[PDB]
């Protein structure tokens, strides 16, 4: 038998679901057909309305304390929770209900992990990360906007193989994917180390792949696997394609000033 | 009960609720009323989420806006970034270099293909395809069907279909049906034979594996997919052919992009378009021509993909507005005209100073107001039946000169057809596609499957759920073809000696006018997208988005006129009122993006 996954959606853009299906190793097809049982997921599921909601009860009963709750997006607390409505009720009520009997909870992406764009100032819906609402369950944060596809499926693969949560850092992120800053192994580091920087877009330095620090790159303060694992089966990552990291896996990255404002105190990242 | 736009709305019948609407992006609730014969006589579209990006953007730097609004949606990923940079560039009088234009067009067309194909197979197909019926299918007859539907597709042997069928069989036999759990399998609303179902489910699996390849085009130019990076003034992916290895774009990277484009063209031509033509033919033969809604009268798009940059007369999907089903008169659409695009909130969870009027988006206001009408059944936090006489959605109500319009690929294809018949040469390819498709649906496919020939015109065939689905597939094909040409133009320009990718003359806010306004429009996968910005002292004064699903999914306006979703559901019989198969089939034909609609 395959471990049930109930994949809930709060306030979100659905980019985490999309990233998930880009996975090449393993293929999402193989994850869905041979690894997990994806029993609830609004994006892909055949059933709607009453038939969809009835699945939750059935899986929770049959697999009590032996299903994974995956959460994409987050619950709003303003508007009496009705800035995100499921089955005529606030999303937060569904989240809490499904969370109570989960074996483990995966907070997909920066939405579930931290709050992300809807939680940026002034946060009109009081969108709140999952770990601030569910306080009595094991949660793994898999941040990024969205996370890398193979990181998402990598977490699932570990959990299914070992029936354990992988080792987490103090922020609740898996060390196997989030131990390095972008800047640690970024291929532009030799330019950073030599003070070789892009100063204006498409200057001669940019055409030579010089470091993007002075164009606002937040790689020095951002933990993710982008510089090594890279994106879409190792095809590229933001810096390789010419734009600085915007810090999309870090808590509160929308409210650290302009993406194009450089980090201060360059000497601390040498 | 009341009449509007030729629809006789009546809420006296049996009320049916569908919440959540699944196999869409984001959150929607749908309610309908059906008459004594299970025919829908009222429909209510409720957007059930809001995040408030327009509010969040206030006071921020226009150069950062694209990244915020990109996160409106990870499905139509990048189209908001494109609208944003266009809006800021329009505000600040910035002309981007040719290579940046071409790379943006390639990225846009890559999104079109990916979004369209994934939608059809992974969200829409299960409304037409019975997966349990596919288990009954005979592999050899499926092979023979595949050869008739698309001769050129190399994956066609009986053994191949047998292997696929076997994996599906043990999956279902396991007792853990996953995404197929509690489905509406066996409903009389399903009409395909087993072998067509097996063919389609096989292509669902093929498309799921292939779709990840196509987006590598985004990854090269924009670093990642979902959410590739954009830039005010151009693109960040600087060019060097040669130290070429160190530049974001070199010839090797461009050759990789071309290889991906070529694969896309094969998929659209051999898998996607043929499947939609075949499925459409079979449901046409069953008489399922419901779901036309507003497509039969009022359609709109801003127009997109000019052959010559900044020259709108050369749009390869030429736009405008059609009213009252008169395809001989296309009205020009101006997104700058305060009297054209306007949004009402009379029946939405927002407030204006005066809700009897619609606001043009440069004057738009986004203040939440979650309140339910007196005739609601249930409570503020436990709705049993929504009261559509009052405020019932997080989606605003966009109208054009007061008219309710349908937007999307179907709208663009009707507009293209109308333009082509006015003499517009830029629309010749979509006209060719439509005439080809009608001939296949009416004559060629029926002849090959031993069914009677029909004589539907495009005027009769296009305004329908089948037509809406067809237009999406044809648009995917056309977009693949267009970016193939864009790629050649890009490489030619670079080899001619123009390597420029960014205009930075007005990158620094010290160079900007102290006040400015701009608009950026995009033919997004689901229809007409616009971002309207006001800039003051280097900061965002106002930022308003009107998104395709905002148009299509909108609630009623001040005059009580219905939007595209609500109109499309009207007058549709349901086989079983508590199985929303027909509701899903038609709603899904719009490819609803609810996070987009509400932002
Ligand atoms: N296409 C599209 Fe989006 Ni997720 C919508 N509606 C965009 O603008
Ligand atoms: S984390 Fe980013 S990509 Fe994922 S749902 Fe949230 S906004 Fe979208
Ligand atoms: S600042 Fe950014 S571009 Fe430069 S070396 Fe560090 S991560 Fe790479
Ligand atoms: S913007 Fe995000 S995708 Fe990686 S390079 Fe930076 S953490
Ligand atoms: Cl965040
Ligand atoms: Mg808006
Ligand atoms: Na730099
Ligand atoms: Na552009
Ligand atoms: Na006609």
């Amino acid at each position: 038998p395959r471990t049930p996954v109930l994949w809930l959606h709060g306030l979100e853009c659905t980019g985490c679901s999309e990233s998930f299906i880009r996975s090449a190793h393993p293929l999402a097809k193989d994850v869905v057909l041979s690894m997990i049982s994806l029993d609830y997921d609004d994006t892909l599921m055949a059933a709607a309305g009453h038939q969809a909601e009835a699945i939750l009860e059935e899986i929770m009963t049959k697999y009590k304390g032996n299903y994974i709750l995956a959460v994409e997006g987050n619950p709003p607390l303003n508007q009496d929770g009705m800035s995100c409505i499921i089955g005529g009720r606030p999303f937060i009520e569904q989240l809490k209900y499904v969370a109570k009997d989960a074996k483990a909870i995966i907070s997909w992406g920066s939405c579930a992990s931290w709050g992300c764009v809807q939680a940026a100032k002034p946060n009109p819906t009081q969108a709140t990360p999952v770990h601030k609402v569910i306080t009595d369950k094991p949660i793994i944060k898999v941040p990024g906007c969205p996370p890398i596809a193979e990181v998402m499926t990598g977490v699932i693969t570990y959990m299914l193989t070992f029936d354990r949560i992988p080792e987490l850092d103090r922020q609740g992120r898996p060390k196997m994917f989030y131990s390095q800053r972008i800047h640690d192994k970024c291929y532009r580091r030799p330019h950073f180390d030599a003070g070789q920087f892009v100063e204006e877009w498409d200057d001669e330095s940019a055409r030579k792949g010089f470091c993007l620090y002075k164009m606002g790159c937040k790689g020095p303060t951002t933990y993710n696997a982008c510089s090594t694992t890279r994106w879409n089966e190792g095809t590229s990552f933001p810096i390789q394609s010419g734009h600085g990291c915007i810090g999309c896996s870090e808590d509160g990255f929308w409210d650290k000033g302009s993406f194009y404002d450089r980090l201060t105190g360059i000497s601390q990242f040498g | 009960a009341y009449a509007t736009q030729g629809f006789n709305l009546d809420d006296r019948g049996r009320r049916i609720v569908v919440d959540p609407v699944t196999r869409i992006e984001g959150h929607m609730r749908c309610e309908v009323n059906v008459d004594a014969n299970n025919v829908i006589r009222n429909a209510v579209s409720t957007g059930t989420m809001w995040r408030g990006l327009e509010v969040i953007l206030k006071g921020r730097d226009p150069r950062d806006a694209w990244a915020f609004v990109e996160r409106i949606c990870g499905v139509c990923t990048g189209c908001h970034a494109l609208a944003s940079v266009r809006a800021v560039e329009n505000a600040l009088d910035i002309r981007i270099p040719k290579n940046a234009h071409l790379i943006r067009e390639i990225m846009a067309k890559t999104l079109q293909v990916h979004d369209h194909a994934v939608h059809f197979y992974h969200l829409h197909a299960l409304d037409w395809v019975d997966v349990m019926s596919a288990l009954k299918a005979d592999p050899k007859r499926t092979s023979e069907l595949q050869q008739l539907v698309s001769p050129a597709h190399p994956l066609s042997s009986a053994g191949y279909f047998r292997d696929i069928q076997n994996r599906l069989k043990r999956f279902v036999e396991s007792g853990q049906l996953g995404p197929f759990m509690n489905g509406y399998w066996g409903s009389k609303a399903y009409v395909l034979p087993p072998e067509a179902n097996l063919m389609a489910v096989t292509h669902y699996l093929e498309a799921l594996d292939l779709q990840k390849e196509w987006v590598k085009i985004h990854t090269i130019f924009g670093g990642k997919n979902p959410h590739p990076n954009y830039l005010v003034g151009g693109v960040p992916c600087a060019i060097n052919l040669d130290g070429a290895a160190s530049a974001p774009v070199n010839m090797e990277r461009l050759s990789f992009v071309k290889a991906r484009i070529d694969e896309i063209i094969e998929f659209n031509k051999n898998v996607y378009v043929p499947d939609v033509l075949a499925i459409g033919t079979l449901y046409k033969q069953a008489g399922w021509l419901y779901g036309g809604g507003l497509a039969a009268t009022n359609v709109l798009d801003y127009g997109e993909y000019p052959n010559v940059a900044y020259n709108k007369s050369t749009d390869q999907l030429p736009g405008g507005a059609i009213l009252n089903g008169n395809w001989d008169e296309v009205f020009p659409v101006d997104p700058r005209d305060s009297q054209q695009v306007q949004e009402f909130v009379s029946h939405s969870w927002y407030k204006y100073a005066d809700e009897s009027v619609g606001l043009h988006p440069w004057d738009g206001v986004t203040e939440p107001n979650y309140v339910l009408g007196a005739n609601t059944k249930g409570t503020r936090t436990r709705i049993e039946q929504i009261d559509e006489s009052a405020k019932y959605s997080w989606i605003k109500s966009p109208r054009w000169r007061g008219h309710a319009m349908e937007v999307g690929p179907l709208s663009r294809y009707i507009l293209a057809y109308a333009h082509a018949r006015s003499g517009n040469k830029y629309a010749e390819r979509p006209k060719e596609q439509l005439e080809y498709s009608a001939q296949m649906i009416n004559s060629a496919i029926p002849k090959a499957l031993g069914l009677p020939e029909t004589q539907y015109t495009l005027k009769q065939l296009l305004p329908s759920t089948i037509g809406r689905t067809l237009a999406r597939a044809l648009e995917s094909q056309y977009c693949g073809e267009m970016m193939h040409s864009d790629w050649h133009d890009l490489v030619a320009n670079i080899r001619a000696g123009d390597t420029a990718t960014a205009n930075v003359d007005k990158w620094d806010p010290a160079t900007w006018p102290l006040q400015a306004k701009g608009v950026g429009t995009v033919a997004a996968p689901r229809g007409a997208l616009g971002h309207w910005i006001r800039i003051k002292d280097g900061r965002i004064e106002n930022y308003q988005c009107v998104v395709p699903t905002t148009w299509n999914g909108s609630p009623r306006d001040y005059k009580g006129q219905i939007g595209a979703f609500e109109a499309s559901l009207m007058n549709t019989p349901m086989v079983n009122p508590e199985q929303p198969v027909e509701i899903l089939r038609t709603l899904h034909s719009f490819d609803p993006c609810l996070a987009c609609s509400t932002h």
Side-chain angles (χ1 to χ4, degrees), chain A, chain B residues 1-241 243-599:
Chain A
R2 294 170 281 112
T3 301
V5 178
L6 304 175
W7 189 311
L8 297 186
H9 295 258
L11 292 178
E12 35 115 32
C13 85
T14 314
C16 292
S17 279
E18 287 283 354
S19 192
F20 188 82
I21 65 163
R22 304 295 188 268
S23 186
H25 301 105
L27 291 167
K29 178 186 70 178
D30 290 325
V31 174
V32 172
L33 297 177
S34 305
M35 301 179 53
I36 65 174
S37 187
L38 185 60
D39 296 335
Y40 189 98
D41 185 347
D42 286 344
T43 307
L44 294 172
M45 66 191 300
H50 308 294
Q51 293 80 42
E53 299 311 83
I55 293 164
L56 290 173
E57 269 70 8
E58 183 181 339
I59 298 303
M60 290 170 57
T61 302
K62 193 183 277 190
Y63 299 92
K64 186 179 180 174
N66 214 20
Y67 62 88
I68 301 183
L69 169 56
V71 185
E72 177 169 7
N74 49 40
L77 301 181
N78 285 348
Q79 298 83 35
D80 285 311
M82 302 296 280
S83 39
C84 188
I85 306 164
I86 314 290
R89 302 182 189 190
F91 169 67
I92 189 157
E93 294 186 359
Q94 186 190 60
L95 177 61
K96 287 177 172 184
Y97 176 68
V98 180
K100 79 194 196 300
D101 292 316
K103 175 162 63 174
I105 302 176
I106 305 174
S107 290
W108 287 137
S110 294
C111 282
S113 295
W114 309 122
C116 208
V117 75
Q118 57 266 35
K121 293 182 193 297
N123 195 354
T125 68
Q126 195 60 40
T128 303
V130 173
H131 72 279
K132 289 196 172 75
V133 170
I134 310 302
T135 60
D136 60 353
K137 282 277 165 172
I139 298 168
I140 173 165
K141 297 198 188 71
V142 185
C145 193
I148 296 162
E150 283 76 10
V151 170
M152 299 181 80
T153 55
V155 167
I156 293 293
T157 298
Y158 183 100
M159 291 172 70
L160 292 182
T161 299
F162 301 114
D163 211 346
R164 297 286 185 275
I165 308 293
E167 189 189 2
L168 308 177
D169 68 17
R170 279 186 217 96
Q171 294 72 33
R173 306 176 289 202
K175 296 194 187 180
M176 66 190 292
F177 302 119
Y178 296 92
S179 293
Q180 301 177 21
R181 292 160 292 193
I182 308 304
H183 184 78
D184 290 345
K185 302 296 177 182
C186 176
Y187 82 104
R188 301 198 181 202
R189 269 298 293 275
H191 297 301
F192 176 91
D193 293 350
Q196 294 176 321
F197 300 108
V198 180
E199 289 272 23
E200 296 180 3
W201 301 110
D202 201 22
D203 68 7
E204 191 47 47
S205 297
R207 294 169 181 200
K208 294 187 293 192
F210 278 16
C211 172
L212 295 166
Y213 187 92
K214 299 182 170 178
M215 303 313 295
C217 186
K218 300 312 189 302
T221 56
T222 302
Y223 288 83
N224 211 334
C226 309
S227 72
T228 55
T229 301
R230 293 190 286 164
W231 277 82
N232 305 104
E233 201 179 358
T235 297
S236 198
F237 73 119
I239 288 149
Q240 181 179 336
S241 296
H243 199 287
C245 176
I246 70 168
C248 80
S249 57
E250 293 292 322
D251 188 17
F253 75 96
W254 305 97
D255 289 309
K256 300 288 175 71
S258 178
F259 297 125
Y260 304 105
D261 287 348
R262 60 186 84 170
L263 289 163
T264 57
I266 192 169
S267 61
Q268 77 195 296
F269 312 116
Chain B
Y2 73 99
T4 180
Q5 303 138 278
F7 296 94
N8 296 321
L9 300 177
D10 193 346
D11 65 356
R12 287 173 288 183
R14 175 178 178 181
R15 193 78 163 200
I16 299 292
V17 177
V18 185
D19 185 356
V21 175
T22 56
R23 277 176 296 115
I24 58 172
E25 188 295 321
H27 301 293
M28 193 184 168
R29 170 184 190 99
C30 184
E31 303 194 20
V32 300
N33 294 84
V34 296
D35 68 15
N37 311 123
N38 292 335
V39 183
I40 295 170
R41 306 286 299 123
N42 185 41
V44 178
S45 173
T46 293
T48 43
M49 64 180 294
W50 178 67
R51 284 169 298 157
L53 273 295
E54 292 156 334
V55 181
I56 289 162
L57 287 162
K58 301 279 212 215
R60 299 185 185 265
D61 193 305
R63 293 168 299 171
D64 295 309
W66 69 264
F68 283 79
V69 295
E70 190 175 43
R71 271 64 174 193
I72 288 167
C73 187
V75 183
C76 59
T77 183
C79 74
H80 290 289
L82 180 62
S84 187
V85 298
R86 285 177 174 181
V88 175
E89 289 153 10
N90 182 240
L92 301 176
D93 192 20
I94 294 163
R95 296 303 181 88
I96 70 179
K98 185 169 185 178
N99 295 329
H101 169 77
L102 290 165
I103 287 165
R104 286 179 181 181
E105 299 297 285
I106 291 164
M107 290 175 74
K109 292 159 188 176
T110 299
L111 179 65
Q112 285 278 31
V113 172
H114 179 267
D115 206 328
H116 289 352
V118 168
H119 174 260
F120 178 69
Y121 287 104
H122 304 125
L123 275 59
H124 208 184
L126 298 183
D127 302 327
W128 314 86
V129 173
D130 187 337
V131 302
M132 301 305 165
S133 179
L135 302 175
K136 297 180 163 65
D138 185 56
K140 59 178 177 56
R141 300 198 222 109
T142 308
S143 179
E144 290 167 359
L145 178 58
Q146 174 63 73
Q147 287 170 195
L148 291 169
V149 167
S150 182
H153 191 49
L155 301 175
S156 63
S157 66
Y160 172 69
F161 288 116
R162 179 173 292 105
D163 288 343
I164 296 298
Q165 190 180 52
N166 283 324
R167 190 173 188 184
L168 199 65
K169 206 173 292 193
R170 13 188 176 82
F171 180 80
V172 171
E173 284 167 352
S174 74
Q176 294 187 279
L177 281 61
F180 311 135
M181 192 172 191
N182 285 10
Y184 311 109
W185 323 120
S187 171
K188 296 313 182 183
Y190 286 118
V191 309
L192 298 183
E195 59 267 11
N197 290 311
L198 181 52
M199 186 185 70
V201 171
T202 300
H203 296 166
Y204 176 115
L205 297 175
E206 288 176 23
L208 187 55
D209 284 2
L210 292 169
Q211 55 75 38
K212 74 199 192 303
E213 303 306 324
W214 311 330
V215 299
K216 295 176 180 181
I217 297 168
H218 277 193
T219 313
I220 288 182
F221 295 128
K224 54 184 274 181
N225 173 289
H227 297 331
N229 296 310
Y230 282 70
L231 185 70
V232 171
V235 297
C237 48
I239 297 163
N240 187 357
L241 306 166
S246 42
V249 176
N250 53 42
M251 194 52 65
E252 183 280 322
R253 297 284 71 186
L254 291 168
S255 296
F256 184 101
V257 167
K258 183 57 158 59
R260 302 295 77 75
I261 290 175
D262 290 342
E263 289 166 352
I264 281 163
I265 290 168
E266 293 309 297
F267 181 82
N268 279 328
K269 172 182 73 77
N270 295 346
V271 182
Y272 183 18
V273 169
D275 281 356
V276 173
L277 292 169
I279 292 172
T281 299
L282 292 168
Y283 277 84
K284 177 220 74 177
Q285 175 56 30
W288 213 82
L289 294 169
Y290 304 99
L294 305 182
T297 49
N298 293 4
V299 300
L300 178 148
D301 192 81
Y302 300 125
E304 191 56 91
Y305 304 137
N307 263 344
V308 173
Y310 298 111
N311 187 339
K312 196 148 186 65
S313 71
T314 71
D315 279 349
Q316 292 169 96
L317 284 171
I322 282 162
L323 295 175
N324 306 312
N326 180 13
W327 293 10
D328 298 330
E329 188 172 34
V330 180
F331 300 106
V333 172
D334 186 355
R336 308 182 72 81
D337 186 339
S338 68
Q339 300 307 291
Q340 290 190 40
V341 177
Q342 301 171 318
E343 293 183 294
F344 293 82
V345 297
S346 308
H347 293 279
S348 311
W349 289 315
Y350 306 99
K351 47 190 299 178
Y352 289 168
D354 181 11
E355 294 180 29
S356 303
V357 298
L359 300 175
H360 185 261
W362 274 325
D363 316 307
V365 173
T366 305
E367 179 179 357
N369 182 25
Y370 175 71
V371 54
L372 302 180
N375 206 27
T376 298
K377 302 201 176 195
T379 73
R380 271 176 65 77
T381 58
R382 211 188 220 83
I383 304 169
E384 290 165 19
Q385 184 178 143
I386 197 158
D387 179 3
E388 72 272 23
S389 72
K391 295 169 173 287
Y392 68 92
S393 188
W394 284 112
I395 308 171
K396 294 188 179 168
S397 298
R399 303 292 188 262
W400 177 77
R401 300 191 179 278
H403 305 279
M405 317 296 287
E406 172 167 329
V407 303
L410 179 57
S411 300
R412 289 191 284 260
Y413 267 66
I414 292 167
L415 284 159
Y417 186 71
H419 276 288
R421 292 177 71 263
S422 181
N424 186 311
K425 301 313 173 197
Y426 303 102
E428 280 187 354
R429 178 57 182 144
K431 179 166 180 281
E432 183 183 49
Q433 289 180 297
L434 288 165
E435 292 170 341
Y436 168 82
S437 297
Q439 199 281 329
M440 292 295 284
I441 288 167
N442 277 319
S443 301
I445 297 171
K447 183 175 175 181
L449 302 175
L451 307 174
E453 292 192 29
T454 52
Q455 306 181 359
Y456 294 107
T457 67
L458 284 166
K459 194 74 150 65
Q460 296 161 355
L461 191 58
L462 291 178
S464 70
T465 288
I466 292 175
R468 194 175 292 107
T469 309
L470 173 62
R472 182 173 294 102
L474 299 182
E475 187 169 89
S476 185
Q477 174 175 50
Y478 187 32
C479 286
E481 291 170 357
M482 280 190 285
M483 69 173 162
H484 189 272
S485 296
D486 297 335
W487 184 92
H488 281 288
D489 293 347
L490 175 63
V491 171
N493 192 51
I494 298 159
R495 289 173 163 161
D498 179 19
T499 58
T501 45
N503 177 354
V504 302
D505 291 356
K506 293 170 192 158
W507 172 257
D508 192 299
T511 65
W512 302 352
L514 295 171
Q515 299 200 27
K517 67 179 181 174
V519 57
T521 61
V522 172
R526 293 156 183 81
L529 173 62
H531 290 200
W532 285 259
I533 190 171
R534 290 191 182 269
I535 297 170
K536 191 173 173 184
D537 300 322
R539 317 308 294 178
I540 295 168
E541 178 185 340
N542 198 13
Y543 200 113
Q544 292 286 321
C545 303
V546 189
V547 187
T549 304
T550 315
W551 290 87
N552 288 335
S554 56
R556 292 147 200 200
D557 59 24
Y558 178 67
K559 292 196 299 181
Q561 298 181 121
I562 64 178
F565 284 11
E566 290 181 5
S568 74
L569 290 173
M570 288 294 289
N571 303 146
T572 306
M574 306 183 68
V575 161
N576 184 344
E578 254 310 309
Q579 291 188 318
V581 173
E582 296 86 352
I583 292 170
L584 294 171
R585 188 181 295 159
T586 288
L587 285 185
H588 292 156
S589 73
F590 289 90
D591 182 12
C593 193
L594 277 288
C596 260
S597 73
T598 57
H599 43 278

